[PDB]
């Protein structure tokens, strides 16, 4: 719970950024023996032990030792070091130590198809890599300058620490490369710099309070840049941090009871597994807030979750009172925008947000772009682009894609959107899921979700574009198509004989454009 | 020259940039039936002729024709189209027509080694490529979706123009890729955006900082982005532009004499060739100004050059007066920074600059940087850094090399510099050419040049460094080494007995660090 | 001469500005026992002494004593306090003390007519004033809350220092008011803020483009903001600063010899004075530089001055070599702009600049304006306007005059000017000294100087405009006039029989427009 003079120290520091938060604590003089970092014991120190409570002074010691090691391995400023692991606190140590040399840690998800994570790191020009034990086979034997593991770091390497350590980053210096989840092919490498990764957070501190975000459970996937942002944010406030590596509901609920977090960060999948779960054994009364990154959680799970714990609210006497329940925030962002431009807040009994994502944070700028890049009048549909001082400088060694994903000065998120008269935004669909048909624009994913919510006979479905030759009828095209549903029935469900009339009856009841034909698929 | 009403109009145009200069001249209602662009005859118009005097409307005709063609081949915004030719006019036509679709023309020097040009285009992810007939062989039979030449483009494709043409560029949208044509290896690919490529000129224009450029001879190499900058800006200011492909001094001198330009744009190589030429026979009486946009020209050349022509200067009565001789400006530009970060002006009778390159223009800021990215006090030696809104956003598809050429927020020019008291910079040497020796820093090409300026016995020499295994003793290092010269004598020179002390005598008479051994080779 | 660790400190201080240099020095931990300020003994210290040389510790203690004094008189942030004195050291001590309470010290020239000095301080709404004993009666017994002198401030007042001292200026907070002096009409009160007054200096320090400033003799008038500006820059750079009150050449030469400056700061008429004494009796050897803020210095005087001393140039080995002579930089600044908008160096064997004044500093932007505020193209005459982060936010309590001196977003300097193709500016005249006339505009001052230089029989002359009642024919009028010259012959010289044709011989030869009549002026 940093004092108001401490918050003053942080905000007066022009040198503080995502590449030196640990060395800034040394400069502030933060207590060298208090425990600052909690782990799930998945990471082995140089000395061979698997600490579950790391002291600030111990963290200095671990980071210097990794730094000296990599300095001895030949790592200079602006080299790239892959980090392919499943340990979240192992991602963390290598992040800081590789940073402290002016080198760029490149996070890769441990469950990447082994030939993909070989070509993903290769394309970046990495000098070498570090893995956990089970991923070491994925890179060893390749053409990397080295491939190491925690075993290869020995206490003695701390003596190899170079002169003038640690590195002084420019705002613009790359301090991490990370990639996004839910990918099937070659992920896109997203660098973040000394300012971009902690910009949002530091804009918080510069005016608002730090609240009682005083015990952080980071159940974000370790390879995601969100997980280092919250970690160093938590190291800046003296709020302790637990680095949960498993995204499994039981595994996080366990770490909830052990650690007792006030705030919990995670993906939608993790939050689902905790909502669809017996919580009568579970303590859970320490949490005041969850944070979701990635795909928004489904409102069903949200309401189960916002039920436990207790939060501060604004008392009618303008003083703080603890109402019961917990706040669940859907951060809408990505690896690129390096935070959460949009924030949907859920609290007990709160209404459905529907398609509303609200308003961008002050520091960021959002527009509903037309095809020539100009923002549109409120009621009209176009590509959601954003600008932000949290935005990456662009995909690593892939300019061609980075500019394909920019329009009229903004970075295209992939979405189609619209505004109300007062400039709130409404998320419609992904732009490739939009079909230009005669009877309007069909938004495939809203269509699919309406049908499944309406027709429990269905197990899944896929709206699809059916067009003549050469007619371009997607969002950017000038032509018209026909929408088809491919209906996947659940086993033993009653199948109506007129599949098209049956589906279009649902659509019309909500005004949606009708499909042209519904077709059963073989599951 | 431009009236104040229509300079105001250009300055008032927030859309104007490097991806639509041609399209804004319409908006200004500039005439379509008068000549604006002169050529050397090396490019095939779609109708099969080789036009040498192009009107504005004809230029719209060629750009629209080419734009329909590339659009018909499936070129979309943000696609890359290689452009491998030796014609400056052919570079210009393709530049604007690929601009106009929102695609990214990638210039490549025609004299690149075929395996190199093939891989340089390949790595950018290009969709296609146009070439002159000589270079078709280099990119054909590959994976490029299409390799075509001027002959594949015909006046029918002018009707294939997509609806909504021409593209509306954002300031940040890429409008060209090109590479620096000094030095071999795999050359590094430099994009420029709609706003970077002309930033310096639009900024001077906004402050109305000027002088009538008159007729513009562009003898810059067509594949260099500077050739496109100067041409665009010439068009925008109503300057007749001549696109001269050959950098050979006599060929430029032919174009000078034929076209009679008020302003010449070139590279030091070409200027060295014109200055050491025989201008007794040459009519240079039209030239009022030369610009160099690359490496600095040798002051020896500049002084013969600035004795030709005439120029206007502010008279004692504050009216203009014509005086003999002309002005030569070094802009100390690169592909990365655009052609104008510094300016060194020279006029007849003016003083040597020595190694002073002066201060950067007001929109750029420069630094002499320590190894940890922090500007050094005047008198010290560090890495020249540049920040500028004229600067590229980074090497195409090569973020790794890009951040290796950046330090404390500046882009590294490759050079070691120092400042004096007034904050003028001085260029000392290229950073890899410095040798730390127990005796001081040896700038090996300052040492070569001093020796060859002093010892007529020498034909060439090569200073080089050697130390023990593991000793780091160049600029990136921390130890020391020994400087060695390798001497080459001209025929019939008397080779002194004590080579090393012969060499170190010249160096110690200027204050230079001595070498520890000189050897004939 | 300042270390790179202290330069880094300064360049990494977001709090540093004209309202707290002294306290930033304390924070940095500068030693308190070294001398940092040298005086001419004109200021009385609290203990009754007149310190000739002041340490850092003493400065702190003198400023705290004054700050607690003014806090007891009731002075609160944003109060204006007049400072009417001849002592430069007294301007300085009161300037820093009044700052440190967040109050605005307002300088006035001690030789100002007292009815004008009382009204200039009444218009600002001041709460009180401090004076030297000779001007106490100028403001005493009027409306001001208090009028005090140095006798009234005493060691005991240091104890009233307010809790939370010193004041934390926002960059946009006023830290001084002051005025210029060639003026008819009530002097315009010119405020500067925490960031305008020191901006140029801090700029040439973050880009390290300074040099050997060495020992600083400030012989600018104490009441001018540049005198505060230069002194605070000296403190930051750790450079002995001498506050010279008197502007008499005789008196500046005394101080040059005593204090041995390497850089001298001053105004034209001081430099003209030095350049005309018998300098052979004098030791100016320590000098390397003169800065002439404000007006332009006479070219013939500069020749005399740049002949003294030595400066240091870069040699063929790219190491410094000392050369005879010194550099004289003509700053063309005003109270509005801070003293450096244009450099203009003069070395031994410089060329005549003629009317050229070079280019502006990189932080400022300047243009030659047409009557509708549009930058004119090279070769045409217009008004000189300046935009700059060092510019004042506007005349204190007089918006009407402020906006009458702006055009197209530029502040009007009063000058007519012109540019060349490279964009160097040329000073033609002050706008009222220009006479509208057929066969062209007469720039009266240039016409005077041309004749004075071509006709040594003349001792002086005056070009002036005659036109009927109800015509304004200067630059801002639309009407026309006849130019007359009024010739003042030197003693006994031969008088031509066609004075009109005799001057229009030299005038038309140079291309200048011609006068209607020449006349004889006896003395």
Automatic annotation (TrEMBL), chains A, C:
Single GO term (MF): CoA-ligase activity
SUPFAM superfamilies with a match to the protein in the record: Acetyl-CoA synthetase-like
Keywords from the UniProt entry: Metal-binding, Nucleotide-binding
Gene3D superfamilies found in the cross-reference section: N-terminal domain of ligase-like (3.40.50.12780)
Pfam families, per database record: AMP-binding
CDD domains linked: AFD_class_I (cd04433)
Annotated InterPro entries: AMP-binding_CS, AMP-dep_synth/lig_dom, ANL_N_sf
PROSITE patterns: AMP_BINDING
Keyword Metal-binding in annotation: yes
Annotated Mg(2+) binding sites: 298, 448, 460
Residue sites binding AMP per the record: 181, 330-331, 333, 413, 415, 430
Positions of the AMP-dependent synthetase/ligase domain: 43-396
Protein name per UniProt: Putative AMP-binding enzyme
